Design a protein around this motif. Structure first.
Motif, PDB file in Angstrom:
ATOM      1  N   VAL A   1       0.834  -1.198   0.000  1.00 13.53           N
ATOM      2  CA  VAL A   1       0.000   0.000   0.000  1.00 13.53           C
ATOM      3  C   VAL A   1       0.869   1.248   0.000  1.00 13.53           C
ATOM      4  O   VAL A   1       0.602   2.208  -0.730  1.00 13.53           O
ATOM      5  CB  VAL A   1      -0.962  -0.014   1.202  1.00 13.53           C
ATOM      6  N   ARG A   2       1.919   1.256   0.822  1.00 11.76           N
ATOM      7  CA  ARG A   2       2.815   2.407   0.865  1.00 11.76           C
ATOM      8  C   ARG A   2       3.543   2.592  -0.461  1.00 11.76           C
ATOM      9  O   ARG A   2       3.727   3.724  -0.923  1.00 11.76           O
ATOM     10  CB  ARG A   2       3.814   2.257   2.010  1.00 11.76           C
ATOM     11  N   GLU A   3       3.969   1.493  -1.085  1.00 12.36           N
ATOM     12  CA  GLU A   3       4.634   1.595  -2.382  1.00 12.36           C
ATOM     13  C   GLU A   3       3.705   2.199  -3.429  1.00 12.36           C
ATOM     14  O   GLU A   3       4.097   3.098  -4.186  1.00 12.36           O
ATOM     15  CB  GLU A   3       5.122   0.218  -2.831  1.00 12.36           C
ATOM     16  N   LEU A   4       2.460   1.721  -3.480  1.00 14.26           N
ATOM     17  CA  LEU A   4       1.506   2.264  -4.441  1.00 14.26           C
ATOM     18  C   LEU A   4       1.182   3.720  -4.134  1.00 14.26           C
ATOM     19  O   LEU A   4       0.992   4.527  -5.053  1.00 14.26           O
ATOM     20  CB  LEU A   4       0.233   1.420  -4.452  1.00 14.26           C
ATOM     21  N   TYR A   5       1.109   4.077  -2.850  1.00 11.75           N
ATOM     22  CA  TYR A   5       0.853   5.465  -2.490  1.00 11.75           C
ATOM     23  C   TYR A   5       1.989   6.367  -2.945  1.00 11.75           C
ATOM     24  O   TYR A   5       1.750   7.476  -3.429  1.00 11.75           O
ATOM     25  CB  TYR A   5       0.634   5.601  -0.984  1.00 11.75           C
ATOM     26  N   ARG A   6       3.235   5.914  -2.793  1.00 11.89           N
ATOM     27  CA  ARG A   6       4.360   6.692  -3.303  1.00 11.89           C
ATOM     28  C   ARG A   6       4.283   6.834  -4.816  1.00 11.89           C
ATOM     29  O   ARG A   6       4.516   7.921  -5.361  1.00 11.89           O
ATOM     30  CB  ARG A   6       5.684   6.044  -2.901  1.00 11.89           C
TER      31      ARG A   6
ATOM     32  N   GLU B   1       3.221  10.884  -9.162  1.00 13.59           N
ATOM     33  CA  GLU B   1       2.654  10.946 -10.501  1.00 13.59           C
ATOM     34  C   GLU B   1       1.716  12.129 -10.707  1.00 13.59           C
ATOM     35  O   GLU B   1       1.504  12.533 -11.854  1.00 13.59           O
ATOM     36  CB  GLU B   1       1.909   9.638 -10.807  1.00 13.59           C
ATOM     37  N   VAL B   2       1.179  12.706  -9.628  1.00 15.70           N
ATOM     38  CA  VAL B   2       0.177  13.768  -9.774  1.00 15.70           C
ATOM     39  C   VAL B   2       0.696  14.964 -10.560  1.00 15.70           C
ATOM     40  O   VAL B   2      -0.056  15.500 -11.389  1.00 15.70           O
ATOM     41  CB  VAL B   2      -0.388  14.152  -8.400  1.00 15.70           C
ATOM     42  N   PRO B   3       1.917  15.472 -10.340  1.00 17.49           N
ATOM     43  CA  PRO B   3       2.392  16.570 -11.200  1.00 17.49           C
ATOM     44  C   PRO B   3       2.423  16.210 -12.674  1.00 17.49           C
ATOM     45  O   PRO B   3       2.033  17.027 -13.518  1.00 17.49           O
ATOM     46  CB  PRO B   3       3.798  16.853 -10.657  1.00 17.49           C
ATOM     47  N   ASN B   4       2.858  14.993 -13.008  1.00 18.25           N
ATOM     48  CA  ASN B   4       2.868  14.572 -14.404  1.00 18.25           C
ATOM     49  C   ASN B   4       1.453  14.480 -14.958  1.00 18.25           C
ATOM     50  O   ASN B   4       1.203  14.857 -16.107  1.00 18.25           O
ATOM     51  CB  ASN B   4       3.586  13.231 -14.544  1.00 18.25           C
ATOM     52  N   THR B   5       0.516  13.970 -14.156  1.00 16.42           N
ATOM     53  CA  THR B   5      -0.870  13.871 -14.600  1.00 16.42           C
ATOM     54  C   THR B   5      -1.460  15.248 -14.865  1.00 16.42           C
ATOM     55  O   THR B   5      -2.155  15.453 -15.866  1.00 16.42           O
ATOM     56  CB  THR B   5      -1.702  13.126 -13.558  1.00 16.42           C
ATOM     57  N   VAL B   6      -1.187  16.207 -13.981  1.00 17.74           N
ATOM     58  CA  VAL B   6      -1.707  17.557 -14.170  1.00 17.74           C
ATOM     59  C   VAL B   6      -1.068  18.212 -15.388  1.00 17.74           C
ATOM     60  O   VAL B   6      -1.733  18.930 -16.144  1.00 17.74           O
ATOM     61  CB  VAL B   6      -1.494  18.393 -12.894  1.00 17.74           C
ATOM     62  N   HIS B   7       0.227  17.974 -15.604  1.00 13.90           N
ATOM     63  CA  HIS B   7       0.911  18.582 -16.740  1.00 13.90           C
ATOM     64  C   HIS B   7       0.412  18.009 -18.063  1.00 13.90           C
ATOM     65  O   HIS B   7       0.105  18.757 -18.997  1.00 13.90           O
ATOM     66  CB  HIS B   7       2.420  18.383 -16.600  1.00 13.90           C
ATOM     67  N   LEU B   8       0.322  16.681 -18.158  1.00 13.90           N
ATOM     68  CA  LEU B   8       0.005  16.041 -19.432  1.00 13.90           C
ATOM     69  C   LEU B   8      -1.457  16.239 -19.812  1.00 13.90           C
ATOM     70  O   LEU B   8      -1.772  16.549 -20.966  1.00 13.90           O
ATOM     71  CB  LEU B   8       0.342  14.551 -19.368  1.00 13.90           C
ATOM     72  N   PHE B   9      -2.366  16.057 -18.857  1.00 20.38           N
ATOM     73  CA  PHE B   9      -3.793  16.175 -19.126  1.00 20.38           C
ATOM     74  C   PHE B   9      -4.272  17.618 -19.160  1.00 20.38           C
ATOM     75  O   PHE B   9      -5.443  17.853 -19.476  1.00 20.38           O
ATOM     76  CB  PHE B   9      -4.592  15.392 -18.083  1.00 20.38           C
ATOM     77  N   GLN B  10      -3.398  18.578 -18.854  1.00 17.12           N
ATOM     78  CA  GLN B  10      -3.750  19.996 -18.823  1.00 17.12           C
ATOM     79  C   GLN B  10      -4.937  20.240 -17.895  1.00 17.12           C
ATOM     80  O   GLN B  10      -5.899  20.927 -18.240  1.00 17.12           O
ATOM     81  CB  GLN B  10      -4.024  20.526 -20.231  1.00 17.12           C
ATOM     82  N   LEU B  11      -4.860  19.657 -16.704  1.00 12.23           N
ATOM     83  CA  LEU B  11      -5.922  19.805 -15.722  1.00 12.23           C
ATOM     84  C   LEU B  11      -5.895  21.202 -15.116  1.00 12.23           C
ATOM     85  O   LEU B  11      -4.829  21.775 -14.878  1.00 12.23           O
ATOM     86  CB  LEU B  11      -5.776  18.754 -14.624  1.00 12.23           C
TER      87      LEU B  11
ATOM     88  N   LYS C   1      -6.840  14.203  -3.505  1.00 12.42           N
ATOM     89  CA  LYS C   1      -7.767  13.206  -4.030  1.00 12.42           C
ATOM     90  C   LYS C   1      -7.182  11.805  -3.933  1.00 12.42           C
ATOM     91  O   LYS C   1      -7.899  10.850  -3.616  1.00 12.42           O
ATOM     92  CB  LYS C   1      -8.140  13.530  -5.475  1.00 12.42           C
ATOM     93  N   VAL C   2      -5.884  11.661  -4.204  1.00 12.14           N
ATOM     94  CA  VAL C   2      -5.233  10.364  -4.037  1.00 12.14           C
ATOM     95  C   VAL C   2      -5.311   9.915  -2.584  1.00 12.14           C
ATOM     96  O   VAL C   2      -5.630   8.755  -2.288  1.00 12.14           O
ATOM     97  CB  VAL C   2      -3.776  10.428  -4.528  1.00 12.14           C
ATOM     98  N   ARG C   3      -5.029  10.832  -1.656  1.00 15.30           N
ATOM     99  CA  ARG C   3      -5.109  10.509  -0.236  1.00 15.30           C
ATOM    100  C   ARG C   3      -6.521  10.095   0.158  1.00 15.30           C
ATOM    101  O   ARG C   3      -6.709   9.132   0.909  1.00 15.30           O
ATOM    102  CB  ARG C   3      -4.653  11.712   0.588  1.00 15.30           C
TER     103      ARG C   3
END
Ligand code: SF4
Ligand code: SF4
Ligand code: SF4
Ligand code: SF4
Ligand code: FES
Ligand SMILES: [Mg+2]
Ligand SMILES: [Zn+2]
Lengths: 114, 48, 96, 117, 85, 208, 54, 124, 689
Positions: free
Chosen positions: A18-23, A28-38, A48-50
């Motif tokens: 669980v900790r590994e997946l949380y890391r 990944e959130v900065p990359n997701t925001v950058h690529l998807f232009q959120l 939201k991940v938390r």
């Protein structure tokens, strides 16, 4: 009764996964925001991940935890490979649903729902 | 139809109509069933 | 036999007509209401009664295999006519 | 045998053929037919609501196969495209108008093909 | 302070309600005679312990467990409620 | 002649029964049951962890060359402790025959992936996972195949509603497609069709 | 079609003249025929390869 | 082979919304025999169905609308224990109704012609 | 001792006298039938159940042939199959082609058994028989061309309903079923002939053409039209109550329901309360919002307290609503809580349930030897209880005696005058029926709660309790048999008495209230003439009959078909009505309305869900959450001792039941009064024809 473990044996290794997946999701959130232009913030994505991790905090079965982290890895690799669109990423946020009432008086006013 | 006219009925349309979509004569759907529940009508006379 | 409601709206053969205060009449503004002018009840009432000299008659609606399932009507009640309820057709025994 | 627009037929006397038996509604694959009925003024077993959602129908012809009185049929018409979605939600009045409009051709086709059924 | 009603819940077959059953059989008639206007509702339980609810003014209720009590113990607990001690 | 009754093939029935006995004798550690349906189909019920040995035997054995994997699916029976029933259909071209191998599993028990025996098992097991929730242990790429991205729930399960829980539309405010709880203008009208009279006495169960 | 009115519907004339035929038409087009319990996998050589149904 | 001293709970895995997990009470029961028929072949398996929710009228076409996903969902079980286990592992509330079987009845055709009892019938 | 028979070679031990059909039923094989009904006598005329015995050259009627030792029954043999095919061939040879226009449709035994046991083709090349249709009332529609002459209706009519106006006239193929005269088969058990008729010859007239069996959804709930607590099934379709059918409960219902239960479901579609209503400046009732109506009611509740607050519970109220109103009125220390039905409070009163319960259960009547009915008309107060009494009479020579007015029950009973002076005479021992009761091995004394509405109800209760005490003293003390019984006619009465409501409105008459909550109270016991000037009335209910016309604030609630609720029948059993449809318009659940009112008034109740409200019900009385249980403690000795100390004088008036005729049966409560079918029944039974 002894059962076949999916992974993790006892609960400690499930918590480790669980900790590994949380890391993995947290980095990944900065990359997701950058690529998807959120239009959301990076802090909003991390929150939201938390929140999505915290709604399964009551699970006490290591196999259920293993399946949950498997599905989390699946939906993470859908985000990394840009298989998902901005549609799904923002579906995570329920931006269009009206706020459901939660008190007895309001629920009584609106309709017959329990 | 000139050689074999169709059977004539009293309910068959005398005038044919083309597709009237996009015109005020177009079909508009509605419920063809009456009201299921009748509500109580309070008395119009005073009380008390 | 079409009839007009007090709001000027045609009444269908099922008696359907929106109330005066019903907002759903707005769908007919700048458009029309689809009402069939022919009333089957009125037409079948216009149909006459066939007199046959038998206690039991059979109706298949006319056309044979193109009509309805063949049924038998018992014409013993002299106070009324026996009605085939597939096609609403009345039969009667000769009185007098 | 062509399956086009739907129609509700009448007996030659003008009486409706449909007897509210709901066989077409039961057999409809896409559940495109909604039927509500009650005794009429003269006691006939007749429908009050007979709806077909033409945007839900798959034009499979099962309703006219299951009809025991040849009431519901699929006519020869296929050029009935509309500009709005609601215009394709036929009701009993619309279907009766279709039957009255296409009765001659429908009757001719049924006469031509009824010996194979 | 102002008692409104008493509700005595006793299971009819469990051993723990034997003392409550004895009170109803041989001591209830005298209690009702002394308190004609007091609603004393005797009801039935399935497997829970016997209870003695006392509804006072403005809907305040207190429940006393009657498990493994005797007829004398039930009488004393009931007269404590009526007296107010 | 009985023109309306399907003719039977006792020769094929006997051959299938003999081969079922053959495989049951060869693999007693896994084979639990062998059946031959009256329309000549051989069915083998094995222990869930014998999948790889049994499939490898049925593929590579000289007397059983089931080199082709025709199909692979699952059946949901909620009344069972192991609700999911994995079914393998194999075709032997050398002997012009077909066989069926059935195993069982529940939500939290993995089933060994047979991608090392048949390559079609890759997508077949991906579909099984996506539609029922069965996890396959050693799968090269196990993920959803048919459902939408981020879809929650396994729809072919008996307890999953027919229309699901969410539906899609385009919202002009957010300039994107949105997912909202399912709401139907006309509810799916459920029909009770079963007759209360028993049709087949041959299948009558004991009252118990 | 198979001459078995409990599986395939009767003809229109038989349905409109025979009581058994009308009953079987009603039941087939409302409930449908019952199928004996069992599982099968049948395949054909469809133009795109083996098309099968389990 | 690990040992888990926990109850089975797959609510987090089924993908059902929290509202339809928490606020749902299924009914485990054997359906009552249809009084219009004498057959008893529909009263042999247990059924699990949910509680009825609101149904309203569509403004257009007057159809019956719904907002409840589980309105048409009925599950079939061979045993009350199996149905209860499924409900428990899926996390819904459940109400169990004990199966009602007809009590045995003593029948006699000769009682229709009793010499001194009221069972004698006045017509056949 | 059991004898061993064989079904298809499988051994089964059956009691002597068991039939072939019952042996096959034991081994799980249901033999086809048309005339056999397990609740009726054996006819053996349809011949559909013919089976083959292994060595017998001749087939036997399985419904009428007792099994012999070592009989092998070949249910699926060639002879049995051919016999079924031949019988079905004859049936369908004379049957008409009416399936699409027939309401039996997809729930017909002729169709299903033809698809399962008969042939798929017809050899009948002749013409069919057409039969004239009869008219037996506005409830049952008769199309007798579909009749298969199975005589189920005749046997049911006679044996069960005690009405002998059905039979067969003529003989041969021209044999017809009917009355032979223009007579309406009017009875409280007339729809069960619709149920038991295997074909569409007898069908429901109100339900005609409306729906088909496969469409309908079945909701298993209970009945509220009386205090029997019949188990029913509500058939809905697209959110509309389509039909009411019986649901088998052999201890209460036993496959039958009364006509009021069956055909009053159409009163739920008329005169309904759908929106909250208040009164404008002109004093007229106008629609408003829940917030405004509850705010006004809460303002009044805050303004007044103590015995200035009253509530009257009607006849169709549930335990959850009753307890919610009780707690809400307790929050203001108010206690003017009453039901609109009188029960004597002198002595034990409502303290002990085995003082107002029907201690000998409905199924316990079959075991009794003598029954004495006091001041009641069970044919209309509790039609299924009267049907059970008729069944016990028929099958056990039960001695029924009635003290009071000679109502026309469906069985022969011994009549005892009309006055409670006879009730006193029996207690003393002068009456010979006292000796009859003493020598009875199992007596039963049923005092109708309608008799307790008199000014001397306490005296009548004391007299019958004294009679029961005399029975107990003379007869053996040992035994779990219970003699004392009370027959209730109101559905909510037992639940209210369990919760602690004061029976009768005497307290409200004694102390007029400033605020009055009419919770479904349509009886009209208390009106504005009795109430003080400018009293504030809130009527919470589902029909506008009396309380809504005379109310200041109107709160729309839910019906039994619309809410999940708890009702307790006359024998103390608790049952839960399930939700079939939802309340119309802005109507809400009753306990939800009361809880919202409490929240707005500031005295918020401690329960927010149905489970929590039922937990409160368990706190007040656990028998309101133990549903199917009917067993309870017996406190007759204490009740009798408390009744002895205070006595009054019986009035010199004859015991006249409120209902003497079937019209008085038809019109009893708000739903029945709002029903058009009940009005048709009343008009038919009054004006005839
Ligand atoms: S053609 Fe088929 S899908 Fe269309 S209405 Fe008829 S039965 Fe339904
Ligand atoms: S099958 Fe024919 S008669 Fe029956 S409901 Fe449909 S259209 Fe009407
Ligand atoms: S009673 Fe049965 S067989 Fe006869 S017409 Fe009606 S549905 Fe058909
Ligand atoms: S009317 Fe019905 S119940 Fe009566 S004899 Fe005829 S088929 Fe039987
Ligand atoms: S059921 Fe036995 S003859 Fe009718
Ligand atoms: Mg019937
Ligand atoms: Zn006709």
């Amino acid at each position: 009764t002894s059962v076949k473990p999916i992974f993790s044996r006892d609960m400690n290794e499930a918590k480790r996964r669980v900790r590994e997946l949380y890391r993995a999701w947290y980095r990944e959130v900065p990359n997701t925001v950058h690529l998807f232009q959120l239009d959301i913030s990076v802090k909003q994505g991390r929150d939201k991940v938390r929140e999505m991790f915290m709604k399964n905090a009551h699970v006490t079965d290591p196999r259920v935890v293993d399946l949950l982290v498997i599905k989390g890895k699946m939906e993470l690799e859908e985000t990394i490979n840009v298989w998902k669109q901005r549609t799904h990423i923002m579906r995570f946020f329920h931006e269009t649903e009206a706020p459901r009432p939660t008190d007895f008086l309001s629920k009584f006013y609106v309709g017959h729902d329990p | 139809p000139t050689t074999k006219p169709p059977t004539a009925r009293k309910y068959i349309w005398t005038n044919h109509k083309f597709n009237v979509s996009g015109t005020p004569q177009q079909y508009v759907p509605y419920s063809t069933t009456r009201k299921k529940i009748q509500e109580w009508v309070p008395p119009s006379t005073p009380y008390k | 036999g079409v009839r007009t409601s007090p709001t000027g709206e045609k009444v269908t053969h099922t008696g359907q007509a929106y109330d005066d205060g019903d907002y759903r009449r707005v769908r007919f503004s700048d458009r029309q209401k689809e009402v069939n002018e022919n009333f089957a009840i009125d037409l079948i009432a216009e149909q006459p009664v066939s007199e046959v000299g038998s206690r039991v008659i059979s109706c298949d609606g006319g056309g044979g295999a193109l009509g309805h399932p063949r049924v038998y009507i018992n014409l013993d009640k002299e106070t009324k006519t026996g009605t085939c309820g597939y096609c609403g057709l009345q039969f009667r025994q000769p009185h007098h | 045998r062509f399956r086009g627009e739907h129609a509700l037929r009448r007996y030659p006397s003008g009486e409706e053929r449909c007897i509210a038996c709901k066989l077409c509604e039961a057999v409809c694959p896409a559940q495109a037919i909604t039927i509500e009925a009650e005794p009429r003024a003269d006691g006939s077993r007749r429908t009050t609501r007979y709806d077909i959602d033409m945007t839900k129908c798959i034009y499979c012809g099962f309703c006219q196969e299951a009809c025991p009185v040849d009431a519901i049929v699929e006519g020869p018409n296929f050029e009935f495209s509309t500009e709005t979605h609601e215009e394709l939600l036929y009701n009993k009045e619309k279907l009766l108008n279709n039957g009255d409009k296409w009765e001659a051709e429908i009757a001719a086709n049924i006469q031509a093909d009824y010996l194979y059924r | 302070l102002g008692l409104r009603e008493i509700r005595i819940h006793l299971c009819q077959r469990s051993p723990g309600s034997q003392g409550v059953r004895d009170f109803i059989e041989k001591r209830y008639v005298e209690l009702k005679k002394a308190n004609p206007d007091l609603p004393i509702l005797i009801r039935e339980c399935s497997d829970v312990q016997p209870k003695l609810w006392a509804r006072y003014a403005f809907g305040q209720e207190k429940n006393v467990s009657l498990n493994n009590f005797s007829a004398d113990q039930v009488t004393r607990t009931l007269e404590n409620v009526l007296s107010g001690k | 002649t009985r023109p309306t009754i399907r003719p039977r093939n006792d020769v094929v029935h006997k051959q299938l029964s003999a081969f079922g006995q053959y495989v049951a004798e060869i693999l007693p550690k896994y084979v639990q049951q062998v059946q031959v349906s009256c329309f000549n189909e051989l069915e083998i019920f094995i222990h869930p962890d014998g999948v790889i040995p049994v499939l490898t035997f049925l593929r590579d054995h000289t007397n059983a060359q089931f080199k082709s994997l025709a199909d692979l699916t699952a059946v949901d029976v909620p009344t069972r402790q192991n609700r999911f029933e994995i079914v393998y259909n194999l075709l032997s071209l050398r002997f012009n025959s077909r066989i069926r191998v059935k195993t069982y599993t529940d939500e939290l028990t993995p089933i060994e992936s047979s991608v090392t025996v048949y390559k079609a098992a890759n997508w077949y097991e991906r579909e099984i996972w996506d539609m029922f929730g069965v996890f396959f242990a050693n799968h090269p790429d196990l993920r959803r195949i048919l459902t939408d991205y981020g879809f929650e729930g396994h729809p072919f399960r008996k307890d999953f509603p027919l229309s699901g829980y969410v539906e899609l539309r385009y919202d002009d405010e957010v300039k994107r497609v949105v997912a909202e709880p399912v709401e139907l203008a006309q509810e799916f009208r459920k029909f009770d069709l079963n007759s209360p009279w028993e049709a087949f006495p041959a299948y009558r169960q004991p009252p118990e | 079609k198979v001459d078995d009115a409990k599986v395939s519907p009767p003809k229109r004339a038989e349905m409109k003249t025979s009581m058994e035929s009308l009953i079987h038409h009603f039941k087939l087009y409302t409930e449908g025929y019952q199928v004996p319990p069992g599982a099968t996998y049948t395949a054909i050589e469809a133009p795109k390869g083996e098309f099968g149904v389990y | 082979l690990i040992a888990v001293d926990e109850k089975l709970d797959i609510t987090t895995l089924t993908g059902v919304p929290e509202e339809h997990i928490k606020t749902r009470k299924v009914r485990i029961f054997v359906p009552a025999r249809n009084n219009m028929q004498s057959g008893v072949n529909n009263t042999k398996k247990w059924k699990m169905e949910f509680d009825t929710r609101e149904r309203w009228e569509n403004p257009l076409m007057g159809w019956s609308s719904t907002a409840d996903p589980l309105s048409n969902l009925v599950l079939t079980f061979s045993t009350k224990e199996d149905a209860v286990a499924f409900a428990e592992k899926n996390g819904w509330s459940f109400d169990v109704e004990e199966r009602k079987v007809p009590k045995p009845k003593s029948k006699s055709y000769g009682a229709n012609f009793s010499w001194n009892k009221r069972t004698r019938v006045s017509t056949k | 001792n059991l004898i061993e028979v064989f079904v298809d070679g499988q051994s089964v031990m059956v009691e002597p006298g068991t039939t072939v059909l019952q042996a096959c039923e034991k081994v799980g094989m249901q033999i086809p039938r048309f005339c056999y009904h397990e609740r009726l006598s054996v006819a053996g005329n349809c011949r559909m159940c013919l089976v083959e015995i292994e060595k017998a050259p001749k087939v036997v009627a399985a419904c009428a042939m007792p099994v012999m030792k070592g009989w092998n029954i070949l249910t699926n043999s060639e002879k049995s199959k051919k016999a079924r095919e031949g019988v079905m061939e004859f049936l369908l040879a004379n049957h008409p082609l009416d399936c699409p226009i027939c309401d039996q449709g997809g729930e017909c035994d002729l169709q299903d058994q033809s698809m399962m046991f008969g042939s798929d083709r017809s050899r009948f090349l002749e013409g069919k028989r057409a039969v004239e249709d009869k008219n037996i009332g506005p409830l049952v529609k008769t199309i007798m061309t579909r009749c298969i002459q199975c005589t189920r209706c005749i046997r049911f009519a006679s044996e069960i309903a005690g009405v002998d106006d059905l039979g067969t006239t003529g003989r041969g193929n021209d044999m017809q079923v009917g009355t032979y005269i223009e007579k309406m088969f009017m009875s409280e058990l007339s729809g069960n002939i619709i149920d038991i008729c295997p074909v569409g010859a007898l069908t429901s007239k109100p339900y005609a053409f409306t729906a088909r069996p496969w469409e309908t959804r079945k909701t298993e709930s209970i009945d509220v039209m009386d205090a029997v607590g019949s188990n029913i099934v509500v058939s809905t379709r697209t959110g509309e109550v389509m039909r009411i059918l019986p649901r088998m409960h052999e201890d209460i219902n036993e496959e039958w329901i009364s006509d009021k239960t069956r055909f009053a479901y159409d009163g739920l579609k008329r005169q309904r309360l759908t929106q909250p209503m208040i009164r404008n400046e002109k004093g007229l009732l106008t629609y408003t919002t829940w917030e405004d109506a509850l705010s006004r009611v809460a303002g009044m509740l805050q303004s007044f307290q103590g015995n200035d607050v009253a509530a009257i519970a009607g006849g169709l109220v549930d335990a959850e609503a009753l307890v919610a109103l009780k707690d809400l009125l307790n929050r203001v220390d108010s206690d003017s809580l009453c039901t609109e039905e009188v029960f004597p409070t002198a002595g034990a009163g409502t303290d002990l349930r085995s003082n107002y319960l029907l201690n000998t259960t409905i199924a316990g009547v079959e075991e009794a030897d003598v029954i004495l009915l006091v001041g009641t008309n069970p044919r209309f107060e509790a039609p299924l209880f009267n049907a059970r009494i008729r069944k016990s009479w028929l099958h056990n020579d039960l001695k029924v005696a009635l003290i009071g007015s000679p109502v026309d029950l469906t069985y022969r009973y011994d009549h005892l005058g009309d006055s409670p002076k006879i009730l006193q005479d029996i207690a003393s021992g002068n009456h010979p029926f006292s000796q009859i009761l003493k020598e009875a091995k199992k007596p039963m004394v049923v005092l109708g709660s309608s008799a307790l509405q008199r000014s001397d109800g306490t005296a009548i209760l004391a007299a019958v309790s004294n009679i029961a005490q005399n029975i107990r003293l003379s007869s053996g003390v040992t035994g779990d048999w219970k003699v004392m019984n009370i027959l209730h006619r109101i559905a909510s009465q037992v639940a209210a008495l369990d919760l602690g409501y004061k029976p009768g409105v005497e307290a409200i008459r004694k102390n007029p209230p400033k605020v009055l909550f009419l919770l479904g109270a349509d009886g009209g016991c208390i009106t504005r003439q009795d109430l003080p000037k400018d009293c504030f009335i809130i009527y919470q209910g589902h029909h506008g009959d009396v309380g809504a016309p005379m109310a200041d604030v109107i709160l729309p609630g839910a019906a039994y078909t619309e809410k999940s609720a708890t009702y307790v029948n006359t024998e103390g059993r608790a049952q839960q009505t399930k939700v079939a449809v939802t309340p119309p318009g802005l109507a809400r659940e009753d306990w939800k309305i009361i809880r919202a009112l409490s929240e707005i008034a500031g005295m918020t109740l401690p329960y927010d869900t149905l489970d929590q409200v039922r937990s409160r019900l368990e706190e007040v009385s656990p028998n309101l959450v133990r549903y199917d249980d009917v067993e309870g403690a017996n406190y007759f000795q204490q009740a009798n001792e408390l009744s002895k100390l205070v006595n009054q004088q019986l009035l010199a008036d004859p015991l006249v039941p409120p209902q003497l005729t079937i019209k008085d049966f038809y019109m009893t409560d708000s739903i029945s009064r709002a029903s058009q079918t009940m009005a048709k029944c009343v008009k038919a039974v009054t004006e005839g024809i």
